[PDB]
Amino acid sequence: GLLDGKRILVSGIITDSSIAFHIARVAQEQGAQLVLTGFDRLRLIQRITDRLPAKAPLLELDVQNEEHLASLAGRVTEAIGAGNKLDGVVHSIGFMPQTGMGINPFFDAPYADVSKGIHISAYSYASMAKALLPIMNPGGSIVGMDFDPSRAMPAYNWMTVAKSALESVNRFVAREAGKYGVRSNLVAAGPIRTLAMSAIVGGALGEEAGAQIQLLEEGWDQRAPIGWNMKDATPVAKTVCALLSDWLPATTGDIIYADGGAHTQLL
Amino acid sequence: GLLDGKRILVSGIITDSSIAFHIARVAQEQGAQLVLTGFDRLRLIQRITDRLPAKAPLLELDVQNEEHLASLAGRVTEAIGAGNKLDGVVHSIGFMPQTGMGINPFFDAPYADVSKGIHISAYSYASMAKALLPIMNPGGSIVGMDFDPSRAMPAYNWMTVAKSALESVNRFVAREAGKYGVRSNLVAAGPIRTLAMSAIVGGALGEEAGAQIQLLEEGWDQRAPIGWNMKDATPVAKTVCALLSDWLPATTGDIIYADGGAHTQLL
Amino acid sequence: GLLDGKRILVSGIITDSSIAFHIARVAQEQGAQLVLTGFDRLRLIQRITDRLPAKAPLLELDVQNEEHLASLAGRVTEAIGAGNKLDGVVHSIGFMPQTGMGINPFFDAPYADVSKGIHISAYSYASMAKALLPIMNPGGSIVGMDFDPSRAMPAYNWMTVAKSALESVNRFVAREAGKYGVRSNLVAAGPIRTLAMSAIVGGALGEEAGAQIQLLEEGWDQRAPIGWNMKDATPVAKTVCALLSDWLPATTGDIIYADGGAHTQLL
Amino acid sequence: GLLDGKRILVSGIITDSSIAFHIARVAQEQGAQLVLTGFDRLRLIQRITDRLPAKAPLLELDVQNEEHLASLAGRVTEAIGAGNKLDGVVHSIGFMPQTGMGINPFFDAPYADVSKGIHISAYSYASMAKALLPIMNPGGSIVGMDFDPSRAMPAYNWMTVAKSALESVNRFVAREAGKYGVRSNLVAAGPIRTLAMSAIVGGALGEEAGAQIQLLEEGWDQRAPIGWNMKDATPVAKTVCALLSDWLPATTGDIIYADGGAHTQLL
Numbered sequence A, B, C, D: 001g002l003l004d005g006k007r008i009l010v011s012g013i014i015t016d017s018s019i020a021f022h023i024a025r026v027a028q029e030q031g032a033q034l035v036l037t038g039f040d041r042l043r044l045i046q047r048i049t050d051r052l053p054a055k056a057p058l059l060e061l062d063v064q065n066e067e068h069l070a071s072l073a074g075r076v077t078e079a080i081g082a083g084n085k086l087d088g089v090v091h092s093i094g095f096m097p098q099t100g101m102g103i104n105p106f107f108d109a110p111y112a113d114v115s116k117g118i119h120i121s122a123y124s125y126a127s128m129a130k131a132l133l134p135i136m137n138p139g140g141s142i143v144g145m146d147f148d149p150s151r152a153m154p155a156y157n158w159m160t161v162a163k164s165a166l167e168s169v170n171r172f173v174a175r176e177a178g179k180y181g182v183r184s185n186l187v188a189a190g191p192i193r194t195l196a197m198s199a200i201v202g203g204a205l206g207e208e209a210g211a212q213i214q215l216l217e218e219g220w221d222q223r224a225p226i227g228w229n230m231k232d233a234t235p236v237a238k239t240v241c242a243l244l245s246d247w248l249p250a251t252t253g254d255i256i257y258a259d260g261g262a263h264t265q266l267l
């Protein structure tokens, strides 16, 4: 039981192939008691989350919604019972309009689209942290989902910029979480065949974008000194759990790369 | 004449202690023919720029204004004469509301303020590039002003996040500028006593923020193996010119640190 | 039992305050079966290791000795019984002569001293890996001890250069270990009061070096968003175990920072 | 005249396609007065250097030779005349035995070979700096040749480790050079078809190594947002001159990438 009797909030589930779905599964397998947040299609998320090895309360959270955020702590302690706190929080949320990643030239994304992408993808990590730290235990852990934005890449465009912003927000959240005895870190994952990701390689964001994404994926397994399996999200789920646990107690403001080692190799 | 007969657009002048003012001075000293852009207080900027060693046309540019951006190329070629192009472009523009840097806790900046800061500070680098590349010569150079956001720092808060976003935008602008034979790079400067910067250390953004900024400055000269003089912007002006020149012809998507070497030293 | 029934070789124990001593303790607490290697003072190491919560075979290993290395795999399988393999290997060995760190100006270390330091500190990670991979199980883990050498620092001098070399050797060991299903990673620790470290702050390597080391230590806890306790090596021991476990299965060629988050913060 | 009346020592010329040959040519084209150092085949180097646009004294320097180093300052001031100092120093020297790069598995390089490689490739930067700083002017510049070792790469093996060591040595040389008003920096170049480099792609270090090097080269021009021409060393020569000049006066302990921007792009 890596996570025995820890209370952990997990966001961002939308299908059975969401990274957050696998994080939640492995975390329960490891003894965690979960609270889940969902966006928009709540009856759908309910139905999907019913397949986790245990039951967990579902709460609505639109990360762009001030009221959702203001009432969040209240609604969580209500779901976990008064006088209980969280030990962990998982941010697994990402969004960039059409316009900002894919077929569209980089120069043609209007700022409103880019601003929305950054709001949901980078800023919400801070506002989740702000809403949840008052109800977190010493020794607690905040983990967010990242990918390595340190070099530019085709197709991902403004989404990459959003991750650069996220990494930076993470170092600041760490300063705040520290006052609570709480850690803040990101997991940088390699590419994973979620529903949306597979749609994009199928050409949902245009044919040039699809081809480039596919090249990025093939290259990944080659560079990774231990290989990369894009259809298996469990290696990244385990990494997040490692961070939710007591076994990385001196790591914060930081990034753990669950990417097969690909980023450490040129080719 | 490092910049002999180069045509260079320089933005962001607001006083005689603006980094852009010194960039513009040194660039003219080096034979450049300049076009200048100003924001908001145009009669003021006119008056300040009159003190440059040579005269240069002033054009209004509010980086958040679509019409300003759409007409920019037209207005520049008009100022430099039909059939002439630019060889260089300097982005020296930065903004973050009150709310996002200083006394305000990091968690208390509303996204609208952060979004405005990012719009002006990071996104505008791309939209300047988009508006100006059609009128840039092969061998040309785009340079933007940066500071090292790779570690978190007190007081700068959301402005730091904005620079992380900027560095990332720069790597993408480089992909686009490359198609024109144009380079894109950032200069990461150490702290400089501009008017605004001195106001902030005087306590304009609160007393805690002021004290922290001052500590950051004193530390800078100590770490810098060659020292740092915060009241002298000419070392950074020279660095930008180095980048506008033909002497860094294989550098792009990159960051040159005009910071005294401070970032290469722990203490 | 994080490490239940894993067989792990641990090197570098010399006193009850060695990082390797604490790694070994926590690993046994977590169900690991250990084999230990010692250098030079073998009766001493025997006596110290007798205090671990369980017994473990001790083997002599002078990392500079070809015969020691050539016979190592033979001697390990002999200690763990034919047909058994290792699941983990810990490199916790460091050395730099007098000459290369401390009072001595950086320019005054002769290459023979620097070469010895690099041999023991960086190269031996590769030669340990070479000697032990033939007897390692798929899913296995090699972990070495590091400190962040990415910026220069007073006093550590050539030892810092040695760590830069080590980080680089680690990325290459990862390519080799990968063929065996084995991971290779480094843990970058903050400063720890080992016997040798305390001697140096007591002025063993001169008074200027001592003063600088002490300043480095005080700064550490201040920058660390979760604090740093230099007299407690257990947070780093736990981190190494995290890496020896199955919970970071997609991390290799990489560095995990068990440093309180200090490296992610400027001040 | 970028380098008008500067006195610059340039090392590492061996043929008309050496990077140092092109550095020396461009530097003279730019008004520099040069002193040259050569290793081993002195009559050969004499003959090659006769083709530079101006004449320059040749001095023997075996970077591994203590007597050569001890007498170096004496012999330089003798060549440039008493009461004159150097303004610049170029380290353009690299070596790794057979054994440490190429066909040989990474694990099969004996430490003596690796130690020699590191001695010549990394350590000599410090010992050149030590020998020459006493005869350098305030405002002076030390520049060494580098390639980006931050990720592992096939074939280069121990040579990559040597560059990691070099980058680290550079940050320490910067601390020492600073006391003299002198800068220390590295230029990280993309691959260049020197005589030795072409021999290696011809299969001098075995067929697997040759094939991998060739793949590395083709990838380079693709990633570089401005392209890369491996048979043209002048873009890197210009970059070194930029660093020898007064136009990067606040950069030290640092690395300038003359690599086409390749390192800033994933693909």
Ligand SMILES: NC(=O)C1=CN([C@@H]2O[C@H](COP(=O)(O)OP(=O)(O)OC[C@H]3O[C@@H](n4cnc5c(N)ncnc54)[C@H](OP(=O)(O)O)[C@@H]3O)[C@@H](O)[C@H]2O)C=C[C@@H]1C(=O)c1ccncc1
Binding pocket: A012, A013, A014, A017, A018, A019, A020, A038, A039, A061, A062, A063, A064, A091, A092, A093, A094, A095, A120, A145, A146, A147, A148, A156, A188, A189, A190, A191, A192, A193, A194, A196, A197
């Ligand atoms: N799928 C992947 O391959 C990865 C996901 N991640 C991150 O992990 C997280 C998991 O993403 P996932 O792929 O599972 O799903 P998602 O679609 O990004 O996010 C889940 C939900 O969050 C949802 N969401 C959107 N807006 C909001 C909102 N306002 N509030 C709350 N949730 C929201 C979003 O809305 P939807 O598309 O359904 O309309 C989804 O419902 C995201 O942060 C990803 O950015 C990181 C690396 C990889 C990756 O993209 C990558 C990229 C480049 N190189 C290597 C790896």
Ligand SMILES: NC(=O)C1=CN([C@@H]2O[C@H](COP(=O)(O)OP(=O)(O)OC[C@H]3O[C@@H](n4cnc5c(N)ncnc54)[C@H](OP(=O)(O)O)[C@@H]3O)[C@@H](O)[C@H]2O)C=C[C@@H]1C(=O)c1ccncc1
Binding pocket: B012, B013, B014, B017, B018, B019, B020, B038, B039, B061, B062, B063, B064, B091, B092, B093, B094, B095, B120, B145, B146, B147, B148, B156, B188, B189, B190, B191, B192, B193, B194, B196, B197
């Ligand atoms: N002053 C400094 O110390 C530095 C400036 N820079 C960058 O260089 C540039 C020069 O800034 P400067 O300090 O000279 O002035 P500024 O106030 O940031 O920008 C100039 C003008 O741009 C203006 N501007 C604002 N909004 C717009 C707009 N919408 N369109 C066009 N211009 C605009 C802005 O508006 P204003 O305050 O007057 O209302 C100013 O008029 C900015 O990018 C800075 O971010 C980078 C490093 C340092 C620095 O902040 C630092 C920080 C931490 N560590 C080390 C160094």
Ligand SMILES: NC(=O)C1=CN([C@@H]2O[C@H](COP(=O)(O)OP(=O)(O)OC[C@H]3O[C@@H](n4cnc5c(N)ncnc54)[C@H](OP(=O)(O)O)[C@@H]3O)[C@@H](O)[C@H]2O)C=C[C@@H]1C(=O)c1ccncc1
Binding pocket: C012, C013, C014, C017, C018, C019, C020, C038, C039, C061, C062, C063, C064, C091, C092, C093, C094, C095, C120, C145, C146, C147, C148, C156, C188, C189, C190, C191, C192, C193, C194, C196, C197
């Ligand atoms: N003590 C510390 O604070 C740290 C240790 N490490 C690493 O962890 C490891 C643990 O070191 P420790 O401090 O526990 O002991 P050690 O003395 O470095 O090494 C253990 C033994 O290895 C021994 N050893 C030496 N030569 C050999 C040899 N040839 N073969 C096998 N073992 C050898 C060495 O020999 P000895 O001094 O006894 O003569 C020791 O017996 C070493 O790699 C350290 O470099 C990393 C970060 C920190 C650190 O130095 C630091 C520095 C700067 N900033 C932040 C942190």
Ligand SMILES: NC(=O)C1=CN([C@@H]2O[C@H](COP(=O)(O)OP(=O)(O)OC[C@H]3O[C@@H](n4cnc5c(N)ncnc54)[C@H](OP(=O)(O)O)[C@@H]3O)[C@@H](O)[C@H]2O)C=C[C@@H]1C(=O)c1ccncc1
Binding pocket: D012, D013, D014, D017, D018, D019, D020, D038, D039, D061, D062, D063, D064, D091, D092, D093, D094, D095, D120, D145, D146, D147, D148, D156, D188, D189, D190, D191, D192, D193, D194, D196, D197
């Ligand atoms: N040729 C290249 O493509 C590059 C050279 N450099 C560096 O620039 C410098 C120029 O190297 P060049 O290729 O011109 O020649 P070299 O053979 O490395 O060095 C010149 C001489 O130095 C010489 N030398 C050797 N030992 C000594 C010695 N003991 N004392 C003085 N000089 C010595 C050496 O000896 P030799 O082979 O002739 O026996 C040569 O005579 C070296 O530091 C290179 O490491 C850096 C990046 C690239 C590069 O290798 C690369 C690699 C991977 N990715 C991107 C780029």
